[PDB]
């Protein structure tokens, strides 16, 4: 329900194949159990990619969760977009006693939006 | 004020494709009214799509996006 967000959701919803439509749309949580019955997932591609995005127009979809849709799409399609492997290395000392997922999310977003 | 009589005679009669058709003052002042509300309606539609975009100015492009429904409607 925004620029580069609604059509972004459209472009990531025609990406996902018809078989695993339920699997990815259930995990990203915007479509609750009641919302799944409204759209007939078995009918057509352009039908579902138009009714689902409307179901986010009423749900006022934001890029924060539109990107989560792309994440869940790739979690089942990780066998594309060839992956580099980065290897971190701490020096001498104790391990990371504080990898708080909240703190790591903060310490990553803050540093990335710093530059 | 309005779009006066000797001007409404002249403007309409310019687009008249023949010389023998006249429009009476009873209909002339109503023609004044209909194009006065042409200005009023085009202006209100433009400023309405302006609050729809929340502007303090009526720009060039607002009028261009209002013609597809202005000429269609009026």
């Amino acid at each position: 329900m925004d620029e580069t967000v609604a059509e972004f959701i459209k472009r990531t919803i025609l990406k996902i194949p018809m078989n695993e439509l339920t699997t990815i749309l259930k995990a990203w949580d915007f479509l609750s159990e009641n919302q799944l019955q409204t759209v007939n997932f078995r009918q057509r591609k352009e039908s579902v990619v138009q009714h689902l995005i409307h179901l986010c127009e009423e749900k006022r979809a934001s890029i924060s969760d539109a990107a989560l849709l792309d994440i869940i799409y790739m979690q089942f399609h990780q066998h594309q977009k060839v992956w580099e492997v980065f290897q971190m290395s701490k020096g001498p000392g104790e391990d990371v006693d504080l990898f708080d997922m909240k703190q790591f999310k903060n310490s990553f977003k803050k540093i990335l939006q710093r530059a | 004020s309005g779009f006066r009589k000797e001007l409404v005679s002249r403007l309409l009669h310019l687009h008249f494709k023949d010389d023998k058709t006249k429009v009476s003052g009873d209909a002339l002042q109503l023609m004044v009214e209909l194009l006065k509300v042409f200005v009023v309606e085009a202006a209100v539609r433009g400023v309405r799509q302006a609050q729809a975009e929340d502007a303090l100015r009526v720009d060039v492009d607002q009028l261009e996006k209002v013609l597809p429904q202005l000429l269609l409607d009026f």
């Binding site: 710093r114 530059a115 | 720009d59 060039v60 492009d61």
Partner: protein, 50 residues
């Protein structure tokens, strides 16, 4: 008449709405860029101050 031959004098010899509008948009963009340099450069001054 003189304005039509002014046409015939300039156009014969020889965007703008995009100019004005896009120039105002890009001026806001350069304000945003000055904000970007204020933020990035100052946070670089703090990072290299560290």
């Amino acid at each position: 008449n003189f304005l039509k031959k002014r046409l015939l004098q300039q156009c014969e010899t020889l965007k703008m709405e995009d100019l004005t509008n896009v120039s105002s948009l890009l001026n806001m963009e350069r304000a945003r860029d000055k904000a970007n340099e204020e933020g990035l450069a100052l946070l670089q001054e703090e990072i290299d101050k560290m």
